[PDB]
């Protein structure tokens, strides 16, 4: 195109219901920004995704207070052996395991978490993400059952804040709010309803680093940063947010570049010893060209999100 | 701008509900003044904060009667482990501990005060600040429970003067008034109702050093000076007030610069051996630029506060 270009990168394994990650990269005065909302989101919800991309490309991010950020391994809803192998090849001591994947059984989840705990040893930290797939009763039951593997916290066990609050009062395992933070009328409900012990922050859906920092301040709860499975361009913003937070009690979910078959930078944001450096990424003209698709449709989508944001 | 310049400095840890300290610095004939009222305060309440800034930048302060001022360690609502470390490394023999933080348990407060007492040893002085969070009955029993750690005084146990007066009649621990002094229609009601043994003075909220000295005399009660978590510019005014008071029976809460991630001076006002020197501070163009932000919003806010003060 010229400045804003679309890409389509296949994932190494189905994650969040997709097998291909699409988005657009935009070059601005501050550097590169990534606009990659998942397909189903309308312009109104994409507005904030645009705001994040705009901030990254045109405004820049708040200075970091740390030069590196710790990350957790991301384990998709796969089999126990491969789940254990992702952990073994991660270099991370904390792992977040997907559970309650549509079409799978609760037995699969137990086997997966078990495999992950064994792969980490007794010292590892194990989290699970339900993406709100369980009702209150099932959540209390499963959390209790899976806690024999010692859980650090359970991310979004149920769909709504009221449900998280109920679960929180019936289990000892800490609860983290994600969807109730990034896809909710009022994110502060988590705080007021004391529905979670930890608040998850994702840069794009929250409208950028400054927006995410403000929300973290308003909630007054321990926070953790995670990605939306972006290329190194999008991940750099996530790293920027994690590096700007006053305190990072939890390893961040920014080791997701491994989930993609390729990246758009010559020096990808790949963790080393479970840690990522705080740095801007330089897009590789040649690397992008290899995964760049026709920009028309994506440019139209970006324009719609922009309008929604400005109007 | 060329005159008033806005800053945004991240805190090392959440305190008083914020994670970033914003404000404006103004250079006048006398030196630098700081205007940093917290976000929620309207122009009428901000009027005194402006008056303090104006006094510091344009008028100068009353000559000091002492060359250094003693300070107490400020302990945020953190875990017992870190609370102890803050005190042990403070160089202070007096520590003020935050209790009744929204969302925390009374058990946490007991654990925190205990850890602080243990850190200071037997000869230390321990105060607690409730920020008016407790009702009368709760304050009475909590003060009794926490007094097994030997409290110097309890700062603002309840929200209103009438409540402080009732608590004072039922407990043996001295009571200090803070918000009942700085955020009240009639500060002297504290004296008239004999609701406190100690009066807390904060420069910006009270409208400056001269205004604070005037109130100190009228209240006819022992006083202590503390900060509003300012940069060295604002803290210099607090030190100036402490240095001009007849006597300082209590160490002052001016050891708060450590709560900020950075300062605007090359020679920051950090205590050494529990004292701060009484001296003007020189702002560093470089240090300020690093945390400076667009002053548009803040300049508009300062003009409103100033307008409210002059009328
Ligand atoms: O947190 C991680 O380990 C990676 C981020 C992640 O899991 C994720 C990725 C895309 C969409 C949603 C989520 C989620 O946290 O639920
Ligand atoms: O007194 C100290 O130790 C530091 C000053 C302090 O506690 C404070 C700082 C900001 C806002 C309110 C207060 C307070 O004393 O209630
Ligand atoms: Mg999640
Ligand atoms: Mg106080």
């Amino acid at each position: 195109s010229l400045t804003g270009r679309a890409f389509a990168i296949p994932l190494r394994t189905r994650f969040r219901g997709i097998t291909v990650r699409e988005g657009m990269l935009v070059r601005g005065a501050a550097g590169w920004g990534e606009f990659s909302p998942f397909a189903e989101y309308g312009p109104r919800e994409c507005a904030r995704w645009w705001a994040a991309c705009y901030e990254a490309a045109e405004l820049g991010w708040p200075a970091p207070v740390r030069d590196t950020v710790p990350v957790n391994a991301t384990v998709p809803a796969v089999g126990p052996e491969e789940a254990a192998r992702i952990v073994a090849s991660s270099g991370c001591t904390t792992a977040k395991v997907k559970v309650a994947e549509r079409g799978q059984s609760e037995a699969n989840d137990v086997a997966r978490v078990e495999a992950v705990r064994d792969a980490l040893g007794p010292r590892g930290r194990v989290r699970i993400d339900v993406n709100g797939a369980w009702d209150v009763d099932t959540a209390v039951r499963m959390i209790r059952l899976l806690d024999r593997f010692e859980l650090e916290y359970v991310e979004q066990p149920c769909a709504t804040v009221d449900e998280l609050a109920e679960v929180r009062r019936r289990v000892s395992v800490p609860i983290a709010a994600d969807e109730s933070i990034r896809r909710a009328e009022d994110p502060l409900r988590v705080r007021d309803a004391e529905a979670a012990d930890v608040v998850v922050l994702k840069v794009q859906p929250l409208g950028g680093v400054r927006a995410a920092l403000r929300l973290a301040e308003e909630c007054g709860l321990p926070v953790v940063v995670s990605s939306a499975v972006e290329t190194s361009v999008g991940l750099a913003a996530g790293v920027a947010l994690a590096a700007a937070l006053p305190e990072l009690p939890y390893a961040c979910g920014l080791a997701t570049l491994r989930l993609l078959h390729a990246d758009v930078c010559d020096d990808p944001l790949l963790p080393v010893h479970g840690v990522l450096p705080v740095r801007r990424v330089d897009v590789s003209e040649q690397r992008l060209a290899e995964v760049e698709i026709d920009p028309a449709a994506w440019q139209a989508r970006l324009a719609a999100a922009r309008a929604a944001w400005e109007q």
Side-chain angles (χ1 to χ4, degrees), chain A:
Chain A
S1 57
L2 193 68
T3 53
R5 307 192 231 170
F7 64 79
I9 303 170
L11 284 66
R12 294 174 187 280
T13 189
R14 185 181 297 282
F15 187 72
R16 189 204 166 297
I18 60 172
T19 60
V20 180
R21 194 78 180 81
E22 275 183 39
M24 189 169 132
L25 301 174
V26 179
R27 226 300 189 180
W32 293 91
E34 180 178 322
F35 172 69
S36 55
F38 296 100
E40 63 267 39
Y41 305 153
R44 291 178 186 279
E45 23 190 343
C46 289
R48 283 191 282 175
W49 290 69
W50 160 247
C53 180
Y54 177 77
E55 175 192 61
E58 205 80 294
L59 309 170
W61 306 306
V65 297
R66 58 184 59 79
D67 297 332
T68 62
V69 297
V71 296
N72 59 271
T74 295
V75 180
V78 296
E81 184 176 61
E82 286 314 310
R85 302 198 159 300
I86 288 177
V87 172
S89 298
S90 76
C92 303
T93 50
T94 293
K96 181 163 154 299
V97 187
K98 168 57 183 169
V99 296
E101 175 72 7
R102 303 296 194 63
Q104 302 192 181
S105 65
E106 304 178 318
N108 292 311
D109 297 318
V110 174
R112 186 175 307 123
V113 178
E114 175 174 57
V116 176
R117 163 55 71 189
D118 298 320
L120 290 174
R123 294 309 305 180
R125 286 162 37 182
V126 177
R127 307 161 181 174
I128 58 173
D129 194 327
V130 198
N131 293 111
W134 297 326
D135 58 294
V136 172
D137 292 346
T138 297
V140 177
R141 174 172 69 74
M142 289 298 293
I143 291 176
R144 289 169 143 289
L145 207 53
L146 294 169
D147 195 44
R148 77 158 172 288
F149 299 114
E150 195 160 312
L151 302 170
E152 177 174 49
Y153 61 69
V154 182
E155 192 169 321
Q156 197 74 208
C158 306
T160 66
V161 169
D162 301 340
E163 290 169 292
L164 301 185
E166 289 188 58
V167 172
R168 186 159 179 278
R169 289 169 53 221
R170 292 166 59 183
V171 303
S172 55
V173 189
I175 301 302
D178 185 10
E179 281 85 337
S180 289
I181 289 301
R182 58 183 167 75
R183 293 195 83 194
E185 310 284 15
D186 208 64
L188 247 48
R189 283 299 313 295
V190 178
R191 174 196 68 189
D192 303 324
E194 295 181 66
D197 296 283
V198 186
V199 164
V200 182
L201 307 171
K202 294 189 187 291
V203 180
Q204 271 192 91
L206 292 180
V209 178
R210 290 192 179 71
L213 289 167
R214 280 195 291 278
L215 184 52
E217 179 178 47
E218 296 165 59
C219 289
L221 292 166
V223 297
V224 64
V225 179
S226 54
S227 76
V229 193
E230 296 107 326
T231 68
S232 289
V233 174
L235 291 175
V239 170
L241 172 63
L245 286 162
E247 53 198 304
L248 280 186
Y250 299 106
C252 298
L254 300 171
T256 52
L257 195 63
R258 293 204 296 286
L259 287 175
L260 304 179
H261 274 296
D263 187 28
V264 301
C265 305
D266 283 313
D267 213 306
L269 279 176
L270 288 174
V272 175
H273 296 165
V275 176
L276 280 176
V278 176
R279 63 182 181 70
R280 288 188 297 296
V281 302
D282 299 302
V283 173
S284 171
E285 179 56 50
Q286 42 189 297
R287 303 286 294 196
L288 172 56
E290 305 186 308
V291 297
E292 167 167 42
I293 55 176
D294 189 80
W298 265 100
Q299 177 57 56
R301 194 176 180 200
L302 183 152
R306 188 174 208 173
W309 177 255
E310 295 179 301
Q311 300 193 295

